């Protein structure tokens, strides 16, 4: 059934699984027309497909051309996501195909189940976790490749950089979710914390700065403080 805090260790077992987040597939700017009506302009989006055990991120860039002359784009966006995830699974060798796909939004269940009818042994599951994957477009290098794309493109990343050399995938996923939660809650403040010390850089082949174990503890504390500072600013408590 559904993925929650009770079955959380399941993310880091040796059964291949992918999370799919569709929250950045269909993206628009809302603006006034000359006549004073309102219109949308689509901007490039992405499917966020992540193996939480390995850190492998399959970022399918959704170019604005895929919306041209289409109706009901928020509905189409779920089906285009399911089409591209299905195409990705079919492109992988059998021994790399996931046994489970967990969608972050329940509206993705039917579109993905219908696209994956050919794979009756791949379980399509919702989650009760509130995962901050919408903040993926706050990672500068992911935002850059999406906004520069002139055509549909798949780009592969490791969202954990080299962390798995030093920490388990449970700990790496915890760090990733805390960083994305902070970026989602106060992007400016989160990026300030990540880049305030110019002596710690981002390697060309990485997404995040090259923090030592001790520096990650300080960064992680600063991110929890940002989230609690922001929470006491939202709710006046």
């Amino acid at each position: 059934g559904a993925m929650n805090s009770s079955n959380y260790a399941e993310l880091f077992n040796n059964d291949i699984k992918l999370f799919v987040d569709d929250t950045n597939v269909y993206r628009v700017t809302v603006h006034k027309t000359f006549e004073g009506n309102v219109a949308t302009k689509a901007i490039n989006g992405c499917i966020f497909t992540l193996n939480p055990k390995t850190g492998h991120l399959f970022l399918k860039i959704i170019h604005t051309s895929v919306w041209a002359g289409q109706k009901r784009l928020s509905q189409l966006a779920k089906w285009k996501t399911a089409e591209e995830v299905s195409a990705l699974v079919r492109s992988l060798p059998k021994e790399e195909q996931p046994k489970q796909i967990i969608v972050t939004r329940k509206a993705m269940l039917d579109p993905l189940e219908v696209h994956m009818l050919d794979f009756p042994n791949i379980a399509i599951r919702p989650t009760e976790l509130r995962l901050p994957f919408s903040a993926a477009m706050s990672i500068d290098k992911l935002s850059d490749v999406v906004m520069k794309a002139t055509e549909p493109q798949m780009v592969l990343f490791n969202i954990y950089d080299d962390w798995l050399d030093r920490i388990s995938s449970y700990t790496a996923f915890s760090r990733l979710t805390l960083l994305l939660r902070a970026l989602k809650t106060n992007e400016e403040s989160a990026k300030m914390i990540l880049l305030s010390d110019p002596t710690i850089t981002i390697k060309s082949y990485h997404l995040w700065p090259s923090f030592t174990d001790e520096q990650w503890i300080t960064i992680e504390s600063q991110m929890r403080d940002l989230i609690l500072t922001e929470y006491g600013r939202k709710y006046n408590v």
Binding site: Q75, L76, W79, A82, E83, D110, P111, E113, V114, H115, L117, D118
Partner: protein, 300 residues
């Protein structure tokens, strides 16, 4: 006007004949039902007074042979049987009629209800859904499962309704996933109507049979089949005009006949709300929408 004689009535039972029903007392001198209209299928059904568990009964057509009911004290039920000896059967029926030991099928001359519930139902189609080829009549009861229920367990005692599954490779063409899931016209018109049923009459026949088994026996799988066949039409953007007009008449008479007290267990809130208020056909079922809004406004 044909007759279904009873050898006897040794156990107290409520007897149904189509939409009508009668109480018979233990060892009451009851010898059957006369004046049964030729031209229609009929169902004779039973609920024992001492164990209302297992409603059960027999679909038949008096044009296909001479049928009678006889209680079996071993198997503990009223069984339908065929009398091959026409003269013996005529002689039995004449005696029971002369002694007025038979209830008369109580049709009002104005009243087209049974025709309206069975218009497309044919005994030959019933016998393919209910497989027992050595008999010309068909046994159904409360607990019989469908071939679809059995996939998700005795195959011989099953209801072989046509499997309808909206999230199945049968329902969805490769490369038309969104189109085929959101508009089921392909599934209805090409797969089901052209492919399996051959025509709308056979499709409606199965839909009408499913409803009647749901209503008369509280057969859950039958209720699931009735709703699936409604939903497949209502979820199709492209349906022949004659099929929509006929569906509206079929459902009107089904909703009209349903006991008011069983609406809660026989009507699926999600399917009816979707069919009348969200579906492609939300404005195509005027008669059905009006009777549903006036009779079951709570459900909606």
């Amino acid at each position: 006007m044909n007759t279904v004689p009873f050898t006897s009535a040794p156990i107290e039972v409520t007897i149904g004949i189509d939409q009508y029903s009668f109480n018979v007392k233990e060892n009451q001198p009851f010898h059957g039902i006369k004046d049964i209209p030729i031209g229609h299928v009929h169902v004779i059904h039973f609920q024992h007074a001492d164990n209302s568990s297992m409603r059960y009964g027999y679909w038949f057509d008096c044009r296909m042979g001479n049928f009678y009911i006889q209680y079996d004290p071993k198997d503990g039920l009223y069984k339908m049987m065929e009398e091959r000896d026409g003269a013996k059967f005529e002689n039995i029926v004449h005696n029971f009629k002369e002694r007025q030991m038979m209830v008369s099928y109580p049709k009002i001359d104005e009243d087209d209800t049974w025709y309206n519930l069975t218009e497309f139902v044919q005994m030959d189609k019933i016998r393919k859904i209910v497989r027992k080829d050595e008999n010309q009549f068909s046994y159904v009861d409360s607990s019989m499962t469908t071939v679809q229920e059995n996939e998700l367990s005795d195959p011989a005692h099953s209801l072989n309704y046509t499997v309808i599954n909206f999230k199945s490779r049968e329902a969805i063409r490769p490369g038309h996933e969104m189109e085929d899931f959101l508009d089921k016209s392909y599934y209805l018109n090409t797969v089901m109507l052209q492919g399996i049923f051959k025509n709308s009459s056979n499709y409606f026949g199965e839909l009408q049979f499913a409803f009647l088994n749901a209503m008369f026996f509280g057969n859950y799988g039958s209720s699931l089949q009735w709703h699936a066949m409604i939903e497949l039409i209502c979820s199709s953007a492209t349906v022949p005009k004659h099929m929509l007009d006929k569906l509206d008449e079929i459902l009107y008479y089904q909703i009209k006949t349903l006991p008011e007290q069983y609406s809660d267990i026989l009507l699926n809130e999600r399917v009816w709300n979707i069919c009348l208020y969200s579906s492609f056909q939300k404005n195509s079922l005027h008669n059905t929408e009006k009777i549903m809004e006036n009779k079951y406004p709570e459900l909606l």
